[PDB]
Amino acid sequence: NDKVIDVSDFGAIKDTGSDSTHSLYKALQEAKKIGATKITFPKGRYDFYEERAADRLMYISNNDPGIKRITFPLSSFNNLEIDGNNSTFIFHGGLVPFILDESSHIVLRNFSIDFSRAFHSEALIAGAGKGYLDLKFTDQFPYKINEAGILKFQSQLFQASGIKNKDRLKRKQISQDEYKYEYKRVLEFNFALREPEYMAQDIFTGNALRAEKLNDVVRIFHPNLKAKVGNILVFQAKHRDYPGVVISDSNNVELHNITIHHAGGMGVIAQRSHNITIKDSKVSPSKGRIVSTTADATHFVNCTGKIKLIDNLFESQKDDATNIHGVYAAIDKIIDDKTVEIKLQHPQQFGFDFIAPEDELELVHGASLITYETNKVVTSTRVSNEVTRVQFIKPFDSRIKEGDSVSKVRSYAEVIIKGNIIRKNRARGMLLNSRGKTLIENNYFHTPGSAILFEGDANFWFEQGGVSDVTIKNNVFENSFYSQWGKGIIAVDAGIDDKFKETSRYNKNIVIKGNTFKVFDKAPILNLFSVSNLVFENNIIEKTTEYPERKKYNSLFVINNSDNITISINNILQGFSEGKSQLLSPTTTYK
């Protein structure tokens, strides 16, 4: 039809293991040429390789920039639905499955994304001693130990060809693939619960560990290795070069019933885009794996309109389930009374262009995150993937210094996050850096880090946060924040120096009602600073014994430098040995 295009008409045949990339490409161009509104896959398994994938330079915020090979290069597509009919997609090597670029009204529906060799690696811990672990790898994680004695994971094990010359080039190719499987650090996971081991920490290794094949078993050596035998050691991928679904300068995108088993980086990363829905989808590992995506499950940078995460499962990724936030760029040079040069600060922010004439920017004091003023841009001149020269309509506030920051005033995204399951990932649940109206309703949280974190800073990540209207209602937080890294189940960790906490009110107007908190010890349920107007009422708090109690904590409510904080008497806490009046009484310390 000129309305519905079947990829098989273009040569893509399921269930054979052959490369479907070019057939898919021609089907895409025909859909655009005639204006078809849907591309369908006959249900089956489709494999995509590097050799015939479109190449484009990409800057992708909070991931690694470079030349990308892209299986679905959805540049300037409009009103196009891709229905996989529950096909499974397998990506071989360094591929970005989807990049939506200047596209509009795109629907992705009914398929799964996976890579044939994960970018992270995993092993069974078979033994442990001072300065070493003994590991067992499955076939799924090929590796070599070279003559230098260094463990190096591989894209695949070299199978000889017959033709001697095809072998020399294939070895060189496998050898250059090593970069993609570089590791950075290791983390112990509980075998039975399939989550980071209780009170285990990241152990920084670098990308080279000393190793020996005992002579089936691999011993790795590092002074700081420690782990329980029988658990699973995860090698964290060093790079974020292959995110799953990139949504960039696009609008009205919907993901329905998408399963992202794996990504080199984040599963879904959206930048400078408007209206995004992710519904009935899954971030969850494929067979034999305890880890899903090697970074965040979802992530939104300078997005507008409505961001909806509805009835999804987000489990087992190496970072947060979501983060919705803006970009700060530091004021690097003051040119004249009207003109500055801003510089993107974090490496995975380089190439993020966002300042244009007529834009309004916040001018922000760095150590306090307090806004001096807003000012309109009349000139924006991109000098590099770091520096942009900005001239304002009027001279900027005379208190502004080099080292302060700007962020664009936006129609901040309205956030609706409901019905999701968030568990077994490594870090936090949700970073709520959304200044727009935010609703967190009917989610389940079981996270090692904070289930919900208000962050943002203008000194390292350079991420704009600061909420103005948040409702967290009818959620279950079950034994969340069980790790050693974090400040509470629901916490503020904005980059506000101690000396400015008393005057900065970065997060405002938060309602926390009707939730159930199942907690195993007395770590903070709320750990707040620089908040104005928060009401915590009609919650149920219920003591458990899921994990050993951490003696470091003896306060459910840590409040500093805030105003209008109501920890209502109408909350219910049962199963604690202390009195209700003590348990609801805020402290300034963990105590």
Add this chain to the structure above:
Amino acid sequence: NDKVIDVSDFGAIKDTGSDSTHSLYKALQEAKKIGATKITFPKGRYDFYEERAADRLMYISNNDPGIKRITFPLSSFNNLEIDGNNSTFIFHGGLVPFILDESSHIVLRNFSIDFSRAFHSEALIAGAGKGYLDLKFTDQFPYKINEAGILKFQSQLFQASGIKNKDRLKRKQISQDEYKYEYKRVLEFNFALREPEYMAQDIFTGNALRAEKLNDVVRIFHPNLKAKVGNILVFQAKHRDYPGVVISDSNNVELHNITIHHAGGMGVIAQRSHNITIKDSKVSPSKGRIVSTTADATHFVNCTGKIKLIDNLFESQKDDATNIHGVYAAIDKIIDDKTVEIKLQHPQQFGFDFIAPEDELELVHGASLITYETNKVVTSTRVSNEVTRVQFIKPFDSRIKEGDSVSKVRSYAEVIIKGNIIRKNRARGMLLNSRGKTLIENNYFHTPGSAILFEGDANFWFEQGGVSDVTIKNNVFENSFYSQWGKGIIAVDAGIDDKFKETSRYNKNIVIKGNTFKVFDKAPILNLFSVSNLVFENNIIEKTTEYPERKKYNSLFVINNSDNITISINNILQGFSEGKSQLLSPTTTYK
């Protein structure tokens, strides 16, 4: 003036160490806007950094592709001379100094190029034992040994700031710079002669060596380490990301009195360009260094017109002094009787586009390098940075198989290489893969590898060679080919399988006259196969004792599968103990 632009008028001030990149940029744009023909630097030292350099995707043949930061982004410039007045240019970090792209009539004159921290590293060998070397590094080569026990070179040593937060970002930045200084292998250099140690070999390490700080001295561990104490160990840079001068799709470019002290990769790399002169220039290390560029000094891919290398010094680079050659692309898929898909084979060839309609291509048998036919292109469709679909005007020769190759029929460059000094580099002198008229006159060669190599192959490098008109006259070859890797002083090593050597005549019409060969043993002066019509006459051959004699060789002239080879009786050989009649008598073996 509107004719001559002084960079200092645009804010570039010598001898201060500040970044001159943006001032230079505005001077470049003004020169293009008004049509000025020259930009001058007041003599001094100018430093260029990453932060404000223009970023562009680049595919650069025989080097590494990616996003490049470019100090002199000479895109679409015409009739422009850059005169440095013997200024010195210092490049900090990952910068490509010059990229000439679609430019015309460009003159670069009177300056030097260097990087503040070399991409390779060097050390004094202070001790040696089984499976280890003991090294001493100077300040110029900063490094860390991390807790894993791995030696990792650094862009710089971290100097604390005062402000604690500027320190955290700077550490992250220094940490991400580590990739640029990765090593691959080590090679021992003779301290006194400043050249690869006699009969030393590359020792493959990989990018991670075990190491210990003895407690000023660094011990590295690897089973295959062996070296003489007092020599200098060079760590070969793993990447070729920052070549010195890129000349791409450009014409009529001249380099006069340019000193390239260092490059991350090749000093000068030219691709698909027409008429290039390099005169009175130097590739030669800066103070404290024994290595110059980390790959070839110069290199020309699919160039046309005249290539002139006149009165230059090319010393101490890690590869060849020059290589002038074409590209083969393998026939990966046969589509129909008229249509194939070609695929670039070597990773550093990806993104090399060269086939367009109306082009004539050679269709070549892979194992023999014999041309089946030429055929004209009517359709070229780039699928990726690897694959292009090519359709011919007529059905191609029915003997063609997948695995054969194509190369474009070109106005092959006329090559004039005269008055150059070639010495102390690691590999060969000149790879003469130039099918156009070639003149090698009045050069001095002192190379560890072959001084002059006819190479090319369609199985690994995929480089088109095959000479048709070569004159090698009045050169001095002094103790060249003193290493264990090579086949002779002047040798053929084309990728022609043994079974086709008898029928393939890939190199034709070579005159070798009036040269002086000073040789220390009886390795081949000529080692030829698949040559037709070569005359070796009026040469002087003179025995020396510069290096120990290699007992493996007892033949100055090894000839196989050739025709019309004249080793004239009018050559002079003095200082040998064998008879003249034996010494000029060809063999089929080293004997």
